[PDB]
Amino acid sequence: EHFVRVNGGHFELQGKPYVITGVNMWYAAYLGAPNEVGDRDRLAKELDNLKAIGVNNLRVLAVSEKSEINSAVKPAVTNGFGNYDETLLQGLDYLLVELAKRDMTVVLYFNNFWQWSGGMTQYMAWIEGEPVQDPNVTNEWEAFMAKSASFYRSEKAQQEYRKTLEKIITRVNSINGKAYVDDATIMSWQLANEPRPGNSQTTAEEKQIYIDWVHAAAAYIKTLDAHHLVSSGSEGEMGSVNDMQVFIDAHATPDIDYLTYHMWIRNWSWFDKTKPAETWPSAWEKAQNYMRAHIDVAKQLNKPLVLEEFGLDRDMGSYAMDSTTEYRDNYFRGVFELMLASLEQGEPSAGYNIWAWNGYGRTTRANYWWQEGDDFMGDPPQEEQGMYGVFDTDTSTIAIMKEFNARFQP
Ligand SMILES: O=C1NC[C@H](CO)[C@@H](O)[C@@H]1O
């Protein structure tokens, strides 16, 4: 029908500006599955609530790789190379039908730097014949990130990645009969969740391999689909081994239509969730700098910029649904205020996706750890259920979302 397009530093839909006022709901396609893995009744109710809060865009995982670790989604879409669960992919079909009824769009990412959907390290585990070592268990994060980036250098891994891209992009929706390439419900194809060049000791050669991978992968998708937007899923500078020139060079290709950045002030040690009053002022100074730096790059490259992930812990780091969210709420207000001013001033700030949406999902696990069969939440299986997710009962947070979702609309 009519697709979301780019014109300079903004998106357009039917010749009018389009601003992303979104959430991350990684599990939305799983929820559409027609078997016991799905919860279609819940999916419709969630999308009805989100639409009522002014949400126009979801960012969703397209594919997962089978993993045996206890920090990963189960079951998976890809049960060994080429062995796709068609019943689960009907969940993506169903999601696309449901979004289209509500004039909502989706950004679909095809891989994962991290472990919670298998992702790049699971590709390498299958190739190498050695199981993934869950970094939640080993705490060997530097080793993990290096293994994950080894994906870019593997010809077999790239062949298999390209096969998966082709499998999904050329899909026909089994429900409505729409080819995916013809479906304007899809806003963008996205290379991966948070692809990084490697660990803190990444070499110049490894930076170039990453740049070349982003270029080649985006160009490959454009051979399949000349018209949908393509984005990388990068965090920005923090996902570029703290080298903004890597970010710039990777995203300078015309086959990348818009820019992404993610902001994780607690993960980056700028904010201490157990010393929030003491650390908030410094964290906010650093967050505003991170936003400004990326807005400047978006001006340089003449592309829209989406804050496609950002979030903050509940008060004192609680996972409980009855805990307060004062710090999170004030953070979201600050980010929204700055971004709205940016947009008013004609800068390439083109919207956002909060990380993440829990909605009607619930856990009764004492340790807040997801187990197979448990409600899917915006917090994926590698984090406590309740870490960053916004519940339907988080009234104060939802009111802020409702307000700004309306204000960001042209
Ligand atoms: O893509 C992501 N970035 C950070 C989130 C919060 O830690 C995490 O859940 C996810 O892997």
d(CA 137, CA 60): 26
Ligand 1 centre to CA of 276 (Å) is 20
- The residue extents of the domains of the chain are 1-410
For a mutational test of ligand 1's pocket, the pick from 307, 376, 388, i.e. the residue with the most ligand atoms closer than 8 A to its C-beta, is 388
Are the C-beta atoms of 304 and 298 separated by less than 8 Å? Answer: yes
Question: Within the chain, what is the greatest distance between any pair of CA atoms?
Answer: 55
Ligand 1, atom 4: closest residue by C-alpha = 264
Q: How was this structure determined?
A: X-ray
Question: For a pocket test of ligand 1, which of 117, 264, 271 has the largest count of ligand atoms closer than 8 A to its C-beta?
Answer: 264
The angle at the Cα of 178, spanning 4 to 28, to the nearest 5 degrees, equals 70
Contact 72, 381 (CB under 8 A): yes
Tokens of 309: 């992930």
Strands (E), 287-366: 305-310, 349-354, 357-359
SS3 for 375? coil
**Does domain 1-410 fall into CATH 3.20.20.80?**
yes
Ligand 1 centroid from CA 20, angstroms = 19
**How close is the Cα of 179 to the center of ligand 1, in Å?**
31
Relative to the CA of 382, which ligand 1 atom is closest? 9
Atom of ligand 1 nearest to the CA of 383: 9
Distances (CA, A) of 200 to 90, 145, 204: 39, 9, 12
What is the resolution in angstroms? 1.7
CA distance 215 to 232: 9
144 SS3 class: helix
Whose tokens are 């995916």? That residue is 180
Distance from Cα 177 to the centre of ligand 1, integer Å: 34
Atom of ligand 1 at shortest distance to CA of 262? 3
Q: Which two tokens stand for residue 361?
A: 């999902």
Q: Where are the beta strands (DSSP E) in 295-361?
A: 305-310, 349-354, 357-359
Closest CA to 64 of 122, 129, 131: 122
| Protein residue closest via CA to atom 7 of ligand 1 | 267
Compute the distance from residue 14 Cα to the ligand 1 centre, in Å.
33
